[model samples]
Target chain A: AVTQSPRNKVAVTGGKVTLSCQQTNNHNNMYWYRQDTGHGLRLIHYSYGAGSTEKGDIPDGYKASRPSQEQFSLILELATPSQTSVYFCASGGGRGSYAEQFFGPGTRLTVLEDLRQVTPPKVSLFEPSKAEIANKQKATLVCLARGFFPDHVELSWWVNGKEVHSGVSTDPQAYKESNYSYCLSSRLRVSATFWHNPRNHFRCQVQFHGLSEEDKWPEGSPKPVTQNISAEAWGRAD
Target chain B: AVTQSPRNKVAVTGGKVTLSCQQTNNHNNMYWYRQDTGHGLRLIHYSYGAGSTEKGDIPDGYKASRPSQEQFSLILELATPSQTSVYFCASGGGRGSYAEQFFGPGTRLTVLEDLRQVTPPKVSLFEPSKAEIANKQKATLVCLARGFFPDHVELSWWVNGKEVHSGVSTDPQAYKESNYSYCLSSRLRVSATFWHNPRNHFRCQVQFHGLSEEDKWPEGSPKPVTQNISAEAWGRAD
Candidate 1:
């Protein structure tokens, strides 16, 4: 389906950087990569086919940037010893969206130890409650989550075991409380009245583009609790 | 990283198939992949570079067999429309192997719908239960995941919000059960009786080599409860 040979680069000089990618499927979304003799494959940059390309952090070394869709580039910016990790490029299949991503072998860059810096998790969904609701009264489930970089952050409700598709709303806000740290916050509200069964379970899931996450809900409080209401709220009580 | 480009292939008929892959850092495991334009990548066979190649399934139209650790071959046993997809090859990484892998762009295989069949999860992880006994109390956690076809699967433990080094255990199993219809299962294991409190958090992640997991426990369920007192006990638990 493609006419061009896949591209690649090896041993890119410290200050000088080269980008390698694969597009055999002639896909609009492509990826960049490097090979690590020890670790298998590391992804550096990703382009959403016909969407956007985003760069990733290569420990103690470089950062990635996606300037356009189907096309992406990785920059050594400044190579270091820790930066000597491999890089990779891929096309995240749009069908499943975040589920499957096509990959390419990686690039290797060596850097000085002084440049090592760690990357952080970008998404989290803290559980508010995970128990049975006990009221004829309505139960309102609230969730609060924030991403230091909130570009692809999302929150949704689930009833029983399936994602909820009832009344849904989302609010996004700028999180500028910390001068040294920048973040974005998201809040969601899901409520079911007395008519809604209380025995059913509910859940919230949060996702970031290319990284793992913190506790879906703060530890310990893994499950939710129930809320009770008065006679007026419970039609049968009065 | 790797220095040579291994031979790659793809089937053009209904039984067509191709292979491709990538490595992380200096790891020496080898892998194979297949895909088609507008389709996702399918992992074929893989081996630990010492020279143990494994064979993989090709649904209704393709098949793969690994003769050595560093190299493997994929055959379209029977060409058909369902065989159309891209293929790739890789080396230097595997399941829980510390080595990262290097991947090649992919070979595109064109399949005709007449031979199409069901699909499997693009990726799968079968994290085995790992445990540590401190004071006769066995604490164990196992993370099981799938559909994470293109990233390094990582697992860690945390006590009271602080990160703790969870010794690396075994690599996940990347093949299906003799009877299971799935193509592969990447399983891993990590265990410690230090459940000081269930509240102490343990996390398992999946992501591009070097990065963290796209989804954690619950989603990845890196931790599984076990009553095993020894390796023999673990076998019986199932």
Candidate 2:
């Protein structure tokens, strides 16, 4: 039999939290894992009696403790939204492959942030709200990261992995709604010659909240959210 | 309102090192941490209001101080090469799961370390019970931990070696004392008929403080405390 403590917990961002579990059968081994809503389970920590704790796959921002044969605890020193999830504890009964592992009732830990009120942006990219193209060889692309926060969200354009700065213009005047959310727009100018390269890739990167860090982002910064400048997109109109 | 002193410093090995931080936000909590490049952002030491520094995930070779609401420092008595890293100072705001933290620019010291320590708790279990003209004979097993720092302890109950889950409830918030200590109360309900068995044992387990250790608890681990029910104490109440 296994039991966990504090079925529901609300933790402050940067606050400390300790999750506890106890089992009666005196299981020799115990494990701690966390599950996000609709997300797969990932191990956080595990331990044996004699206060032995081992870091599991995702031990960042967390610590594990085993006090006796029947107890295991996971500690979060500086809790954050990234650490908020449903935590589960389990005790293993035997060493065999068919060992019976029992899980305690899960604890829902919600680490509250001051910006828990963060409203994500709804971004739309198109060939300029107007045909600023004027049926010319050059065209303008507009990207509006709108309805974000009481929000310097940065917007960038990349052509074939080369960053665009001179050809881009962003709003100095932000648009805010009555309720106090914001919308900002950026415009990038591209020539028909640049757009006609079928193999050429263009991407728009947004930074701030869920930002893709610039430095050391080759294997990690694989792709951006939007990068469409297609054959049928806006060449004919420009 | 949070700023760290000596934004960059180089100290020789065996030198006494001090990293200072000041915040005018009047926050009740302050924290110190040393972040290794590409490594985890670990907790070192944390403090509440003033004059109290709780050991964090890393406490060896370090000392924490909170002299005033605006000041907190981490003192290294004998600095070494292993402690070199960029140290971060953060001030926390608010309470509960929704609290927030503001961080200073950070200080890079030649000697540094990650926090692998936590506060120890004082745990006691008791079931001294009687009610005037008692009708309900169910027993209440209370486990109280007094003077714990930075609060996140788990409490549980086991009856006759069986882990009890549904019958246990704990404080929604740990009571904060004037001196920066904390308290959490838990009660486990037992059925009237189950209380008469003299051979039966009920134990309360508290997890969170140090226990046994592997590499996780850098300073030390505190073991859980257990207490038994006076098998006859509850049956006589009826």
Candidate 3:
């Protein structure tokens, strides 16, 4: 079994933090990874040591070490609130690219942040197919959330204020790109009859969990937000 | 998210069985796999359906169907006692060779087998390396278990009758070869001091969970079993 030290921790700005892992299976390679609200999982560093360490994607502020055959450590210097999240360690079988990797229980850490300064996500809607004006055909609508911080958010869909739960699926694990912020997508499938009716409007809503009314900027606080998009433009006889 | 229908099941000899899965996440590929005592995991069938089904490595008596975009099914004709196992269905992102696959909670099935004729697994041990006789060194020992039926089994190591939990790792999942039986390996690591002594004896044990004393096989039942190997063979200077 694999185990991690310090199952939970609280850190202040500019402090140093270390997460250690040990795999008794005698695996040759070990990895350190982190999970945040918007980003599903990201690798920090890895080692294949008798005494060697290797940098991984997004290793900008992390360091790692492998002093022996069974142990590896991940270090964070100049800690920031953005760095807080659940971290995991993993080990791989010694051979082949297709070998499976085993993961350890995670360590959860929190770094204090100013919630007032965070920005709300930009929500956009896309239709994967043109609405068939003739018959009741199935079409897909996708809602994309971009530039969200503190990662934790809820997404939902509505057909003219009637909550649409059936034929809906969201990526329980969100995705991250360049800025370390998160992006999420949810899909809604419906009959083209719903899309062709100009009287019907569909709305996609996102709720940010890291911000609250107590945060300063009450005038522009990031409360639960919603974005509405209509496919009425497709109803015209063009 | 994915959901399975008929979360549990039971069947008698020669009965027909159907296990169904639904992947509403819009993934293109779906798979069916089974877990049994000696074998870690074996693929029974899979589909990347737009109306297509692909036979996996071990699909002999099983058939699968994708009647709709969101549903897939595994059918087992002539359900025998040996055909019972915990089955899992999985979905993968549509593109690329490396997309991640997500698994649904498993469905457990039981088929009653006559208690008198169960077979026992064969066990063996191997050393991955020979420690240098001159200095302090590290080596790995692997225990292999094979030719067993029903899939739930326990594997552990003992150093001179003392259960060795530390410095030991077993396959969280087992592996299968040509036959329906399974093979598993556990690795144990230690220092040269532990390996160079003639008094050190290591034992590898396998316990089958589906058989018991009350259910027959009074004399040759597949109960707790073990195999031992020694480093005394390497103790002589050479």
Candidate 4:
């Protein structure tokens, strides 16, 4: 039992009032946020209920509504004082691949005060080397990550207790060591009769987004036990 | 032009294949989600398209289908590997007082291969007290949190550079010292003529989800130039 639609663009320079919201983790994917300033960007068109409707292209004084279907509405008729507004809610369930959007900490519609400047991004963590294993053979772990924006990123590889059956790559550029820009330079290779059982302990992980500067390095990387067993050329890219 | 529904529960094992998606930056506020490891976690019904429907009671293997309105598909016929599962996606724009929904990063459908632990959240930037503006009235700024769940945290404030205001009250709960459990604690205050207005440079932001470990307390705390105090509290955890 659900259906709604209310699209009020803008028109209140004398007073000020506006409210609209959305959320769909249930199954239709709908969002119509309206908080401009503190943070709440991304609003175009989406009303996947029954009366159905779609249109969301955020920018400037907003306007969106979907009557019937699941329900949708966002109005701001003038509402001066800089259009007091604060409405949030998100849901973008894996659409064509890597879909992630869920945030709610927005709703601070101001009327006379204005202050905007958004800057956020910085996270770090990398630990590989586990003593460069090689008690007899088998050991390949390298991690040198940098900055974010590698499509939000999500990497994993663990050995010793399982989770490292080869095939793990990511080096699509982004390797500038000075001024920043370094989201990955991954590698996870485990071989040596399969890392000598004893419950291996090789791990690799990298996940980014919602940052403000980061750094991680420790565990694994002692480089000692080695037989120098050879075998070159498998997958290369500096 | 947008509608979604049909997805009760999906757990595949034979060959392993899982795909659950969603997109709601603005649809109509319809983000419903369900998956319980324990307890009565119900409510997984909602629609807004032409076939709009909203029913919730409990469906076994969970097999729903509503592919148009906006998006919908939930299937799980025979996934026995002990049915390793924990998948959740939610969003809400149902407009019931505009309760938002933005949630992701919860997918675990294993064929007996589990060890996926994720902890992401960290943001930085610190600077408070500009030339003892007269006699230290008020210009708070501190952000170097740690771990998470702090009452669902959020804090944003800026002056001279913009961003306006947000949250404005300190002393929320979530404080554990070491064993990991800083649920959340925020603080952001500004006054004293907005802080001596030395070309303005006052910002305090603290938003979380994971990744933060800071206690910074060494600037000795000092700020005063012109004069205009207002800050009885901005740091605690008893």
Candidate 5:
């Protein structure tokens, strides 16, 4: 089992703080990760502390220390608003171990800064197969967004200008692309009857990067491109 | 954008074979993994071939090659029946790429031999949370098995010795463990009324490593410990 450093922490700009993790399972390997909007999931550092520490793929401004077999810590020397995000600590079953990893409850940190001025995501729509829609089964519609930064975003669905919530599932987390950008997907599942209705108009909307922040960057964060598809149009296109 | 090689293959003992994969996404990192019973999912090899090959944590008897930007291969010099399993090739987004990995469909291989005398799994049962079963919601009973090899196994449930199938869901696939073993889980979701009935005795059973094999050191394989939970017992304990 893995446990977090603290449930919450607030750090002032340029302050130095250490986030710790403990694996009561006595695991030798531990990892530190950060989640940010647009950047998705980033590996900050990891350790296999048989008395050693290895910097991870994105060790730019982060340092990891492993003092014992069950303990690891992530240290941030200069905190910035950009550094504010949820941090997760994980334990990988030690050497020659073949088991799933254990993650701790996340630690949230916030630093002072303007959350706006971040990148806006580019959105597109992908439809499921006909076989998936037939048999009166659930039709899954995927809304894909890529090339976004500062990973926090909001996704919603609307039908005929009315908001729809139930049966909509969005990934709790987004993914980081190799380009150092982020991609996220939200899936909307609807009854076959909903898609068969020719008059039903559907749209997926995304808001992020202060798009809804009227006080900051009033131009309103690049309006998230809403992608739409209709029953008749989907049928004819295929 | 990933594709598997051959899709399927059949081999003989002591034969040499190679499985290949291609990723059109231009990923710089590729991985080779095998699925077997007892050992849930095992990493055989991986490559970050800008020019050289770095063996993975479990590269014994497996060789990997990435000669081009879009291609990778897993080679078996001398195969055994035990080596037969479904193999998956994956591409990681590469250097600073923290995104979800892309996996090919997978290639299934089987070598001619007796299918028995493989790995045996350790099974246990877990009860759903109170909230999960509250409000007469479906009562979920999960059967978890770990540390096994040759990933093929059969699981079933019985209510008063009558085989129950409907509403049973097995893991679409097994999860690889850190110790080079495997973990598989099966879930049975039933109406809360089923658990409320004291007369409804429920048990979960697993069969693997050929329980019917009469020869080759068989006292009919280790009888999988059948674990059961009862409403009367739960009510008394909780």
Candidate 6:
């Protein structure tokens, strides 16, 4: 499982730019490939785990780094408009002389007169997980999220304006389909009386991490959803 | 969305065979496509809404039916070994001559001296949806099922040999991914007291319905899961 950062970005000509890639399945080798209008695919650089960098077929203005076993980065030392191309980061390492490689989704890096962008995950407010039968001693709520490009997002639940850590469970891995429907969900359970009578506001948020370098943002903010629930949902199921 | 029935099957040389398909988008035209070892894809018949049938390229032994606006079926008057092929059902009708068609997963029929075969969904036992905490007032359990062909399955909960009809909510549509991961889930809510004490055995099952023509079973039985509980799940959170 490999993922690229900055799914959609604009890079400036002759500006510093870095492309990030991460692999969940540990691999010993990684490579960088670029494709543009005329060039189908050109190998830029290759890296070995524990920080070994090697120049590939075409390493004109790029540098590769293997900072750790899980990450490989391709840095453009002064990008140019000619460098405007789709980048593919791949992990290659297995038996048989390591001919096979698994590629991550291509990152569209549009290098223009100036560099700038990222896809944010869409989040659904919250839905009652249970059918809300009468006298529901408990209330289970689910927060749905999808369309995460990097598939690296956090789900959180808040009560009465306070962040909660207990009684909440989020899916371990995002359910990815078509490589775009990166669906994620979190479940929160609370006592029925505590959910409604206390007049507490509940919040569910999807904290997306795919950030743009131009944003200058410190830890991207979350897409938040809050609702003040009542007791009416119970009888709706009775 | 469109889905097929009897995803994998074997048909008797001279037996009657029926292929069923259903659409959700309410398209007005549907067509049957057959692809054999040598032929790429040959149109057998096309159906229009309101029970209209028209033969197409290769309707040697096939009869198309439009039972309703939502369903289209292809029936083989007398199956032959030569009819062993993969069949695809499609619905085409939109603006512009209806050139664009939505197709369902292909149904593989192995016509031989005998007819048989079908796929069953795999069900995982109920998992506690919440992290058990002391003084917990309720528990939400989720049963996961996937790999459903025809995408028709039911989830049910049983308490002490009696079927339960409330406090449970199943997904409205199966979460299909990659054409095979037809994932589905059902959530059941119960008081923490009812969950641990009183010795209630809870069972969750995935009832599959892509039945084979050979099985004499009436209404397929569910793949059941049962668990006996105690108070120990609590305090692990405390």
Instruction: For model 1, report the TM-score of its A chain.
Output: 0.32
Per-model TM against the reference: 0.24, 0.26, 0.27, 0.20, 0.27, 0.27
On residues B1-238, what C-alpha lDDT tens digit does candidate 1 reach at each position?
Answer: 3322223222224343334233335455666666544556655665655445555443344455544434455556656655444467666656434256566655444332321121112221112222222353222433333222221223333334444554434343333333322222222223343432333333333221211122122321111111000000111111
Whole-model lDDT per candidate? 0.37, 0.61, 0.63, 0.39, 0.62, 0.62
lDDT value, residue A21 of candidate 6: 92
Per-residue lDDT tens digits of candidate 6, residues B28-128? Answer: 88888888655677788887675898888888888888989988999998888788788998887732244688889988775654212233454433334
Candidate 1: regions farther than 4 A off:
A1-73, A79-141, A146-154, A172-174, A180-191, A194-196, A208-238, B1-238
Given candidate 3, what's the lDDT at residue B158?
74
Ten residues in sequence with the least summed lDDT for candidate 6 chain B: B229-238
- DockQ (C-alpha based) per candidate is 0.01, 0.01, 0.01, 0.02, 0.01, 0.01
Per-residue alpha-carbon lDDT of candidate 2 for residues A1-238, written as tens digits (9 for 90 to 100): 8889866555557878888998897778898989865688788888756479888788999988888888898888998879878789888853222347888888777665543333334444444323233465223566555555424345667667678787888877557764536787776787766655556555555443321122111231121111111111222211
- How does candidate 4 fare on TM-score? 0.20
Give the per-residue lDDT digits (tens) of candidate 3, residues B61-109.
8999988768889998888877778988888853223358778888776
* Per-residue lDDT over A1-54 for candidate 5, one digit per residue giving the tens place of the 0 to 100 score: 788866555555687768999888777788888876567766788887756788
Fnat: each model in turn: 0.00, 0.00, 0.00, 0.03, 0.00, 0.00
What DockQ does candidate 3 score? Answer: 0.01
TM-score of chain B of each: 0.33, 0.45, 0.47, 0.24, 0.47, 0.49
Worst ten in a row by lDDT for model 4 chain A? A223-232
Q: Over the full model, what C-alpha lDDT does candidate 2 score relative to the true structure?
A: 0.61
The residue-level lDDT of candidate 4 at B2 comes to 25
TM-score of 1: 0.24
DockQ result, candidate 2: 0.01
